[PDB]
Each structure stands twice: as C-alpha cells, then as structure tokens.
DNA sequence: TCAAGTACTTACGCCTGGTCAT
RNA sequence: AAGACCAGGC
C-alpha cells in the first residue's frame, strides 16, 4: 500500500488494493479525479478495460461495405 | 432445583452406565458406541481438550 | 485367406467346470470366445423386484440386489425365452420372463435364514440352483419379507448378474516360447499347470516362427448354465453376432452400390 | 445422475445404423467401417481374420472412446479386390470356423460323457 | 492521423484479430451481408474467419496512440499472422 | 453386513458358504482348511469369507419396528 | 474486482487419454443446464427450430427463446406453439453442444495457463475429463480435484477465447519461453520403453498403433527388418507421429558424459542421445528431456516450427498410440522393485556402519577437545558440519549402491529415467537408507533435557539419537526413526499449509502494482498515466513466447 | 430509456455538501421518525420511506416506476440537531 | 515412588519429578496432565513377570485386570515432565539384555512402541514403511471412509449418513485394530488391486474399477438424509399445520407434485421421491394459507426410508423424514488405501475388458504405478503382498508397525509356497485382445476405502438462476443454485490474456448487469421514470441533460454507500 | 392414519391436531407404517 | 441455558460476550465412521490462532511421544495445532494434594 | 532536526456441508 | 436470510 497508493494513479485503482475507504475519503476531501484510464477503474464500472481487445476501437468502412452479398 | 446439567453419555450419571449389551440394544443403543459426548437438542456434541 | 480348422480336446468335464483345449485358431478368436463366456452368453436372472413387505434389517434395494445375483437354472428354456424388449406383450409374460414369489416371516425365537430355497418359481425348470442355499436375509422374530420378482433373459454385458460363469481360466503358450511376457528372472516363476518342460529349465527356447495357438480353457459355471452349455451358447452367440453383422453389411453394400 | 443405461452398449436405438461404409481418400482401395454398439469381441476377431487374407494390405480396428460404443475398422486391400469383399469374406470365414468349432466341441462333449 | 506517416505495426495484433473476428461474426449473425462467397457455411464465426483470410471484413481498426492520436487501419491493410 | 453373493472379482457363489464356513471353524477346521473344504480356491473367493464381518447378527439384536 | 458469475459449472475432474488437448469432457446434465444464446438466421433457422421443438427435456435442445422485444419465451414448461415461432432476429438459448468454446479453470489461477479455453465433448457420467498433458498447466491431479467451466455467452467473447485462450495457443508460456505441457506419466514411461532399440513390432501391432494416429497419411512404412520376418521398430512408428519435418537434438537421462568426447559419439552404444531429422526419429530414447516441458524439447520445436494446431495433434497422437502400445507391454510397481541383491544390502550396511563409526570418532574428538574449529564456525557448528557431512556422504554412497543394483527391468528406475515420476533419492530411500531427518535445517532438536527422546541417554550426538534413519522404507523404520521421520515431514506439511497465503499475497501485490502496465501502439510500455515504464518491452520489444536460448559463438 | 447511453470517462470525487444532500434528498424535512411502520404501511419520514425505494417487491416506487429492479433507490437525509465530526474526515 | 507403586497415599495420577541439577522435586496432582503407562525396570529386569501374564490370560472369571497390574507395582503412569527424568527401553528383550553397553540404568520400558499412534493412524498396515505425510493423509482419510459407522444406524435420524453394503475387515491388520473395534465396524473392502497402467484412465491419482465387480455389489453404499420440520404457533392467529395442500388453498405454491403426501402431509416410507418432490407439506396462516412445504435436495432421487412423528420440547408436532439413496460407485467417486494413496475412479471396465490372470482373476481396482515412487508408500506394496499371502493361507496378516519378525522376504517366501511369484507379480492377459502383457503385474488383495466425497454430491451447473438480495449477484453455494466465483485471481488471469470482452462478460454481463441515470452536470444518479419519461436530477433542476449509464449493480451499490459516507463519486460522461 | 409406536410397536390411529401419544404405553415417538403403493426395484 | 448454549454453539463463555468467548469448543460429533467418532472423542486443540504463520507451535515436539499421535493432524490451517491422543495416552483428572 | 517512542494496521485462493441463534 | 462458527475438500 505504501508505494502503490503513493503513485499518482486514480483513487479507484488504489481503492482496489488494501485501503479502499481511506483512499476514497482522501480523494473526496481533496476532490481527486479518476481519469478512468486504468483496468481496475473500468472493471468497477463495467466498461471495456483498455487491455487487449479493448485498447483499440473498431469502425465500419462504408466503402468496403459496398461489396456485400445478401443485403 | 437450580438447573439441569447436560450429562455426558455412558458416564456415571448417564442412564447407559453399567448396562449390558442386551440392555443397550433394548434401548436401541449401540454397544460399541463409546459415549463421551453430550446430546444438546438432539445434536451430539463432543468437548475437545 | 480361408478359415483355419480348429480342434477341441476336453480334459475335465464336471457339473461345475469344463477344462478344454482349442488348437489351430487365432488368439483373437480364442479371446473373443472367452469374452462371450462372460459378456454375451444369455442367461435368466431376476431383474424386476417388487416388495410388498420388508421388515428385515436390510433395506429394499439391498435384498433386491441380492436376489438379482441369485443364479437360476436356465439350461434349456433360455433359448426359448425372448428378451422383454423383443416381446410383443406389455410388462412381463411367460414367453419373456419367469415369475418368482417370496413370503417368509419369522415367528419362532430362533433366527430365520431366508434362502434361495424360499424363492418359488412359476416354472418347474428355472430354480435358484437348488436341486447349500444362498442366504438372502436373516429374520428376527416379528420380521417379514414378501416380494414378487420376474426373471429376465440377458447377458453379462448389461449386468454381471447375467454372467453365467465363475472365473474363466485362460492361457496360451504355457512355457514362454513366444516371449509375449518377458521374465527379468525366469527362474523364480512357478511353472504352469500345462507346462511341458523339465524342472531344470524355466522357459522354452524362443520360437521366432511361432504364433499363439493351443489355448487352454477352464470355464467354471455358476450353476445357471451347464459349463459345457456355456461354451455352446458362446459359440452360437458369437456366430449370431457375426451373421447379423454380415446381413447388415450386405444390406449396406447393396444400398451404397 | 448422468449414468448411461446398461443396454446402451449393444442396443441400437432409432435411426442408428449397425455398420457404415465410408471410403478412405488418402489411399486407394481402402475403406473405413463404423460398427455401432460393438466392442473388441467382434473388432479384434475381424481384424485377425482380415490379416489372414493375402490380398488385405491393411487391417486394423479401434474404439475411439471406451465410454462410447463404436468400432472403426480400417481395411485396405490389393487392386481389383474391394475392402467390402474382404470384410464379407472374413465374416464368412469366422462363421465357418465357429460352426466347425461348435460341431467338434459337441462331438468332444459326447465322447467325454460315457465314452 | 492520415494514411501517410502511420507509425504502427503493419501486422494485425492477436487482440485486433480476436475482436475483429468476434465483431464480424456478430454482424453476420445479425443478417449482415457476407463479403465472401460461402460454400455451405452457416456458422458466423467461420464466415468471419474466411472473410479475414480473404481480406474482406469491412472494419477499420482505430489504434489510439498514448498521446491521444489515432491511426485508422483497415483489416485488409493489415497482414494477418495466419 | 451380510455374506455377499457372487464374489466381487470372479463371480463364484459364496453366499451359500458362510454358515458352512462358520460350522467348519467351530468344529475342527482352521480357516485355510475350511475354505478348501468349501471349494474356495481363488484367493478372490477366499477373501470373501475370510474378511467377512457378519454385522447382520448384531443388527438382529435390535427389536423390530413392528412386533 | 471479483464476483459470482452465471453460466458456470464445477465438478470433479477425471482423466481421459482419448480426448484432444483442447477438448474437455462435459457431463450431459451440465450441458443441458448451461445454455448459449444463438441469434436465428435463415442459415440456422431450421436447426434452431428443431432445437426448440426438442425443448428443455431432450438434451440437444433449447431452454429459452428471446424475441426482438426482449421478452423471454420459456421452453422448459410446455410452451404454446405460437411462442415456438423463430423469425430472424430471435435469440434461442440452446443447450451446450459438442465443439462449444468454454473457459476451463482450476483455482488458484497462478498464471494465464491456469485458465484456458477448451472445446466441449459430451461424455457419459458426471465428471469433467481433460487430457493428461493439460494437467501440468492447471497443476491438477485426479484425486477429488474440481475445476470450473465458464461458458462465454457472446460471439465476441467466444472469438476472444478461441483466438487468445485456447489450450494449443497456451502451449509455450512467455514466462520461461518453454512449453507448459509435456508428455507425462504412463505415456512418458511407455514412450521411454517404446523408444529402445529392442522394441520390434509385428504387422498387426503396427496396424493397430497406426489406427490411433490421426495425422497418418495411410501409407505403412517399410519395416526396419524385412527378413526373416517383417518387424517395425518403435522409433520407426514414433517418427510417423512427429509433425512435419522437425530437426531436434536432445539427450536421454542415462547419457554418459564420455560419449561426446570419445568414439561412438554418433552411434550411441546405449542408444542414448536423441536425434530427430526431417521429422524422423533417427536415434535415441525419449524422456522428459525430449517430450517434457523444457526449453528446446521436441514438443517445443514442434510448436516453434509447425504451430499450435499441429502441436495439439502431436500431443494427442503420442498419448493415444503410446497408451495403446503400453496395452501390450504394460507397466507396474511391486515389491520386486523395492528389493535389491544380497550383496547390495551388505554393501549398504557396511557403508552405514562405517558412517556410524566415523560419527563416533568425531564425537570422541569433540569430547577430547581435539576438534579444531573451522574458521567462521563455532565448535558445535563445526561438529554438526562434520556429522552432517559424514551422514550425507553415507546416504549418497548407499543411494549410488542401490541405484547400480537396479536391473533394466526395475520399474522405479523405469519411471525415474523416463522422468514421469520419482527421482534417485526416492530409490535410495526405498531401497538403501531413508536418511537424516531435519527440523529447521538442523538435526532433530533436544526436546527433552539434553536428549531427543526418553529412550536415549543425555548428550547423545550420534546419528541414531539425532534423527538419522539407518533403515529404508522397504526395511521399515524403528520407533525412534518413525517419530523422527514424522517430525521431519511435519515441517514440510507446515510449509505447504503456510506458503499458499504468503505467495498469494505477494502475487496480488505484484498484480496490483502492474495491472495497468501494457505495451502501447508505439511499442512503449506505459502505465495508466502514460508514464514510460519502458521504451521497449523487455528492452528489445519482443514477446517472451517466441524467444529461445542461443549461443553467440563469437563470445569466448 | 429515452436518455442517451453514455460511458463514464471520468469520476470526480468530493464531499457531499449539506445543501446538495438536502436538495438531492427525496424526503422533505428529513427522517424524523425511527419507526419503519406504524399502521402496517410505511410511514413517510421514517426509515422505510416509499419515496426512498421499493417495498414488497411487487409495488412501485413513489418517485419512479420501481418494479423493485428498475428502481435504483433514492437518498434521504437526517438534519442533525448539532454538528457531528465525520470519523473518516476527523484526521483531515 | 514406593507409595505410588503400592497406591497407599499417592494415587497413580500424581507425577513426581526430581531435577537433580537444579535440586528440585516437583509433585503434581492437578488435572490436565497427559500421562501414559510404562513398565517398570528394576536393575536390568522388567518387573512384569510371567505370573502376571499368566494371570492376565485368565482375566475372565479371575477378577485380575489392569488395575491389579498397576497396584502390583509393575506398570506406572508417567507424564511428560516426569518422562524427562525417565530412562526408557523401547523393547525389553533387545535393550535390557547385556551387549556392547549403551545404557544399564533403564528405569522403564515401553509396553509396545506402536502405542504412539492414535485411533486413525493405528489402522495403517506397515506405517513404518511409508512416508510420514502419507501416514498423515491416511489418518485424515480414515475419518472419511464409509462403513457401518454405528450398529444402531436404523434408529438414528442423522443428516448425511453413509453406510456401506459389504464392509470387510482387513486381511492385513494391526494388533491395535482389535482395541479400536475396527473388525466390528470396518470401513472398506479387501479389493484385488493391480498396480498397472492399463488404458491410461488410472493416470495421475485416478483408479480403474471393475464394472462387473461393482455390479456384484463391490463398494456399494447407501446415503441417508434426514429432514426435520416443526409446526409452530408464533402469531396471535398465525400457525403451522402439517397437511396436504390443495391446488388453490395456499397463496404460495410450487410447480412440484404434492400427490405423494398423506392426509397428514407426510410422505409414507417406501415412496420413491425424485428431485423437487415435497417431503413434508406445511401451511402458514397469513394474518388464507401460505405454503411452507419442504422439498428434496436437488437430484437426490432416493426412496423414503423412515418417517418419525413426535413432539418437541414445546410440545408441537415434530417430524424427521429419512430418505435413503443407494449410490453405486461411479467414475467420480473417491477411493483410497490405508497409505495416503487417494484417487478418483477414472473409468470402469467389465470383467471381459479388465486384464485377467491365468486363473481368471480380474482386479477390482487398477491403480497407476506412478503413484508409488514419489509418494513412497512401500507399506502399500507390503500390505498387498501380505494380503495375497493371507488370502491364500487363510490367516489374517499381521502388520503391526515395529515387529522385527515380519520381513518382506518372509512374506515373499510364504507367497512362493502357494504357487505365486514371491514378489507378488503375476502374468496378466490383455482383456481386449487376450494377449499376455509383456510386463508382469503386481496383483493382490489390498484393503481400499470408499470416501464420503462423491461426484454427484459435488457436481454443479449454473445458468442464470437465483441472485442475492443486496448485491443482485448470483447466489453462493451449490445447494442454493449458486454461481461460481470469478475471483480477483481469475480477473488477473484474464487481464494477462488480454480478453477485455470476456472479462467484461464475467464481471459485468454474466453477473449483475444494471443501468442508472446520472446527471450530466453533476455525476450523481437521477430520478428516472421510464414509463412517464420524466428524468429529473434533484439538485441541478436538470430535466434535459440526463444520461444513461450501464454499470454493474455492485458498482451502484458502492457509489450509494460512498454517498452514505458523504463522498460524492460523481460519474462524469463528458 | 395408522402410526406404529417405537416402544410397544403397536398400531394406533390418530388424526390431525391430535397429540402423539401411544395408547397403553404413553410413548411419544411413532412411525409411518410403510405405504401400500408398490415401487419397482431393479435388481441391478 | 448457559450450559446448553455453550455446549451447542461452542462459544465457551457468556452469550453476550461471545467475542471474548473462545469458540470452536464442543464440536458436533462426527458420525461419518466409527473411526471418525473415536478420533473426535480423543482430540486436543491448541487455542492459538489458525491464521498465525508461526511454524514452531505447529511443529511436532519431541515431548509428544506416546502422548499425541505423530501422524493424525488436520492438514490445512490447523496443521500441528489440532492434535489427537495416542492409544495409551491418559489425561490426569486431578487430585487434592493434602 | 531527530529520533525514539507509541499507536495502528494488515496476510489465503476457490469449493462443500452443517449447526445455531438472531 | 444471511450472518457467526465449525468441520471438511484440492
Ligand atoms: Zn412377454
Ligand atoms: Zn472369486
Ligand atoms: Zn424509485
Ligand atoms: Zn445534477
Ligand atoms: Zn406404544
């Protein structure tokens, strides 16, 4: 906890390791903001973590769709 | 009367003390049962040293 | 590409055991005949048990399992009987089953041994191997056992109750000539009952040109079938399986071509 | 709770063919026989009989899974000799051997009893 | 970023491959037109696989660089390991 | 509990040999001799009677539920 | 950070050598309970209609129908015909079937190979069945062990597991750039017995073995021996299992250290070493050094050259064909493997007696102040050093004597040289001497006043009083030796029961320290705050799965 | 479900001011009664407040369509007679 | 010491310790001191003479017992701190005799060194030939073996009672099993066990069982489950009555079948009950009726054995229903010998498929040879050898630990006298092909145990069932149809896989999926009336800019708990 | 509804809302008198 | 009620003081096997915490010879802590030293 | 500035079941 | 209805 909770990471990442309520009280008192860039933070809020298969984004190519069969 | 002390089975103050195997089977009690436990609300409890 | 001509030499023939030697046949044929002795020889045994009263210290399925393991004399009517699956009747009928009745109550202070002798069959020929007696359950005074049981036709593949034989002794190459087993110390192995070598030598010299033949058998019947009838039924059943497979293969060849 | 019935090893249920004949495309004059509700008793004896045929190049059997009840017999033969013909010949051979064995065993039983 | 000056692996990553395959299989299972000619293929996962082998999946992979920039790579522009 | 029928390994009838085994033990025979007298040759059959404990006799000391 | 999940199954695991590496045996009840929602298309509308018709009762059926409105028609309770209508867009929750992708886990999940994706194979009875080469990644054995079955519920997560977490894709770990799976147990022992020169196979035996080779081209190879009778060799058949054209060189466990220097370097008089050229086992006897989970092994080369799909077939074919050959040869353990010769027993006893006399002499020197303390050690410390040296040398000598007495038919030696199970110390303890029993790295402490047990006199520093078991397991331990062995094994039991918590805490601390550290799209390793932990991963930008041990040949 | 679906890109922490708690609170005047029910029905201003959530699992919230599953629960408040130190914030 | 030996003033419990170096004599009479009897050695001779043994041999009808032995000054109870000052001889005929002198001042002798073991460790044959962890494992496993746990199990209404069909006393026994009453109540069957590699299904720790033997009753068992239920009078008019409910008289009702109940709402014994069937029918009067009936544990499929009706302490109706189920050993059940060799049943082969000797013997159990070398249970092998000797001879083998008269060579020589290879190896034939196995197999009767752990009691499958009231996540436990926990280690493993979507499924979709409406200005959840579509944020007067956010229900609960602690976890979508 | 007493093993008939007490013995533990409907047991 | 509660729940002490009361005493007798019943009736407990990682109290002390079984120990978090009596082991019942 | 106290925390993974008293 | 404890499994 002394070293992982000292990193300038989000309060939600710290609250997942050994302090929880204390980290969140410190964040509330100081108005700390969680940029939601980590894995634990996104897992807590049920969002696709920026891990593999989540670190990129998929787009539909409309030009490439102009070659479809049974439309 | 001041209370009821749970009685360890097959002890001196148990009803199975001194009973023969025939007497024990007459009460549907196993002669090979060593006793040494208490019956609290049907459950058999054993005190660990 | 044709059939070898096997020969049989029977050495011992009792009411419990048949010891015979089959010569000039494949090891696979002999082992299949041995497997059919255990697996595919039809035999009548109790499979349907219904209990009216059971006050004994053994629960209902205990005594049912014990009843199913009681051998029944199925010497001739096993072939006449049909599998209950192949029978047109619903439930059970005399052409597919043999009914049994048990009614024992202990009234005396002496213990009552319920035996296979207390099994009563509707057929005079299917008897629980009682021309001692197999113990079903022991009854204290006041304990009763009444049940009805039907005996079905089956073989040992479905259940061991339909295994017509005790331990089937099988052996080939008594003196180790083919070296199908290698002894790290041959001198410390007892010589076989069928060994033909002297006390001085432990195993026969290796025969590179040899193949497994002259298979030694000792089929011990459990009394349900005569031990000679076990081998006859096994050969007939193996041939029946081969004939059915041939019929279906011929149909498949005609259909696909 | 997942116990298969004991008759599931020999009984053919609805729509299950006893034997299925499929050609093997890797090798010429080779076929694969799938026997349903059959085990080593027939497979080993058929494999052994097929090896007696000089025109059978390959003869083998296996059970893909012991918890399932199926035999795969792979038979390869010489040109101008179908593997199905070899299989039929092997089965007829086995039946002929079994009939002779049964007759000789009955004669031996008769000789042993009062003789 | 534009098509020129893309500084990223020309190879499709295994994570990109997995997500593209799953997304395209879901699209096919939801009645999306199949870009490749299928020969008795009814499993959307397998159709997505054969589109991937044919470089026909109409998906652009947007790769976000840690400085906030992104590069749009079409699936056909990436070289598949398989 | 009770003497099993059909010895587990081979399948020989051993359920009819418990009382005879007890009698042979009670009169003269040693256990090895008594097993031979009953024809129990294979040790799979011998262990059926040699290792058998007849708890059903102890179970008969309890009165039945119905008189 | 963790929670209970739907679509999960747990049951005991039992072996199945007839399953593939990526296959898992699943009981019918579990598959009839777990359901996968499948979107109906004109491609699968008829199949899903049949599944709906079968309902929840018949196993290859369905449990629910989800319409476009989101309303769920239950198919478990006599549904009404109109609610069984499947138009494109509906989701029918069909029962889990063969080939379904599932996540297989055995807690604790130490690494990512401890939770891999498998392929469902429905089998009778009620246990999960997994191939024995998958036992090593999970750290599993089949004594009451239970595993978890997580079934992905979407096509996207199904593809994720298929393309990332499949067992063949997890063969080589990035942890040590070695395989996590190898040929183990009966298959390894029978491979060792099958790869010797003496193994000559008949025609029918070869055909039966080839029937269990899935990658067989159908051509029976010409035998090594043509006359006087055709005989194929075990290496000849195994060369048909080796995928593609794999070039590999290994050594057997019993390889002498003089062969490479002297003659017969390329002839291998004991048939040791291992050479596989062009996917053909030219020479050598295989063991855990060739088919095990180690760097540069034959399976490792198969993965690095052929790929996961063919390596899976390699594993499965080895398992099947070698088990079916072992059906002929067989393997056992008995008293005869625990018994040595009379001369070996006498030699062991002479060694033990000499060691006890040496300890008595050291004790006499210490009692007469003739023991000069080694620098850096006290008098008691140097005395204990000398006594432990004598006893360890005695146990090593007795173990060597016991090992040299084993014949080639000995089964302890058979499972040791193959690497399947056991070691030379086990053979030594079974046959020669159990050895010294230590508590906290020292001889058995004086629990009583200046004596280990009441049966000894005070200040008894001899081997017997302090826990040296002169007897072997075959011989049996004396009561003092029995109690001292119990004291020694108690320490191992305590360590086993206490290590798990501390190691798990360390692992959790590490994972919380580095959970968000990943390789970015510019190949820089960064944390959640985009701080550059490493400019390139491993300082070289490579994954740990593909790298191999190599020599510079220009250094030194 | 007319509101657009959104992902949380940032979580801002802070201390709920008493004014914000009172504005947010669904009970008016605070929780004055410690009783849950008085006549078999949940009393307004008590611990079990129908404005605060769904009860009986088949009824509906007083502030929204509850269904016992769609209702996320609503906050109430207690106006303390005198200020009280916060244990979590006491060191601060 | 003389007084304690004569039992004049000092009772045998009292311990007397003389610390000679410290000049202290400590006498203890208090309770709790652990002591054991030891024979007394005066000079170099035991005080236990032949006359004491002769008198004890006639212990019946002689009134001569252990107390007479203690009162005669032959044996003495010594506790640990007095055992500090004692000089003990392990065996008399070895350590008190004159030899190369080690000790001549022996003051006590062990009665027998096998008495160091407890109840469960005394059932181990040849424990001194096993590794100590294996002895510990067997000591743990013996309490889990199934037999006849008590003779009056018929009258006992015990939850989770297991009784074995055919318990057998071991062919190889310890001299202490007589005093442990193990012969009377044994847990296990002497099984013909082949330590062999047959088809790979006994690999790792698994075992291969004979299906034909299992059919013949081998290791068959019965499972007894007792259900307790009690009528009660709690409310003024609320009461519980045992009765058979009708279709519409009870408010609550299950889709189960109540036709098996009697007029008293209790199923009679002999009625075959499957899963979900109602054991006891009970109704609760609601201040018409509410169903409180009890159902079977899922998939038990047993038959009602005994139903008991009585009155409890309060005098209310009290019922105990015992349901019996016969459990044939499957391929998931757990078996172990008395040497720590535990394992499940890999597969079952019938008699024809099992390997067979020249005499037709087929092993009941096949265990892998790989379980022996690392685990070093040589006592297992010696037990098998001695059991093979004893079954053929007709005696019961003696496996008391430290005998010095029962060697492996003696057992081998005895086995060689019955036509068998002295080391226990026997030539086996492949069941499938009939061919000899090249290696000869070690076969003999080894005592095996059937453990309480069975696959049917451990098999569970979850697919979207019950959820917890607070967390809205799947329930916990196989009995509650619960879902398996995807813990933090599993999450880390899936992070290492880079499977973000599967991780989201397990931690968001498979478990509780939820939606909330948060304000856009503040990050606090807003009142959302979906039917009326009136979304309002109390605190901003925000009715227009309110967003929909999908989050796990546990996360909403966490945020509400943080708000309960005055923390504002404002979820910002901008 | 016939119950079998556990002490004197006699059959007594009692109805609902009747305390359990065997006649002529005064014992409060009874048994259910196994049903008449027959259940088939496979002798397997 | 005090006796019945302390024997039933096992918390040795007053019900209101259950936390200060030692728990785990008076287990439910194990009827799985007769050997299990005997082992439960002859069983000793070390009151120290199971979560404690100290290995010394868990070790097999030399003084346990003939007093406590060297082999029967709860494998797991109670290794060395829960112990069982030897066959000949006896525990003094107490006497007045008058 | 310091440094020596003293208060104060914090370590088990998954799984089963049973019993007990609110 | 879900907590406490206990026992156990790997
Ligand atoms: Zn009919
Ligand atoms: Zn037998
Ligand atoms: Zn609401
Ligand atoms: Zn707002
Ligand atoms: Zn009465």
Author numbering:
A (entry chain A): 1416 to 1486
B (entry chain B): 148 to 196
C (entry chain C): 2 to 132, 146 to 271
D (entry chain K): 1 to 115
E (entry chain F): 46 to 127
F (entry chain J): 1 to 67
G (entry chain A): 355 to 910
H (entry chain A): 11 to 102
Copy the relevant paper text.
RECQL5 is a regulator of transcription elongation known to interact directly with Pol II, thereby playing important roles in suppressing genome instability. In this study, we solved several cryo-EM structures of Pol II ECs complexed with RECQL5 in different nucleotide-binding states of the helicase. The RECQL5 IRI module, encompassing the αN helix and KIX domain, wraps around the surface of the RPB1 lower jaw with exquisite molecular complementarity, serving as an anchor point of RECQL5 on Pol II. Meanwhile, the helicase domain binds to the RPB1 upper jaw and downstream DNA.
Our cryo-EM processing showed the coexistence of both free and RECQL5-bound ECs in our sample. By selecting particles without RECQL5, we were able to solve the structure of a free EC containing only Pol II and the nucleic acid scaffold at 2.6 Å overall resolution (ECFree). The good local resolution (2.3–3.1 Å) attained for the Pol II core region allowed us to assign unambiguously the DNA/RNA register. In ECFree, the tDNA i site base G14 is positioned a distance of 8.7 Å from the RPB1 bridge helix (Cα of RPB1 T854 taken as a reference point). Moreover, when superimposed on the bridge helix, ECFree showed great similarity to the Pol II–α-amanitin structure (RMSD = 0.5 Å). Moreover, while we did not observe density in ECFree corresponding to the single-stranded ntDNA (indicating it is not stably tethered to Pol II), in ECREC-Apo this region is stabilized through contacts with the RECQL5 helicase and RQC domains.
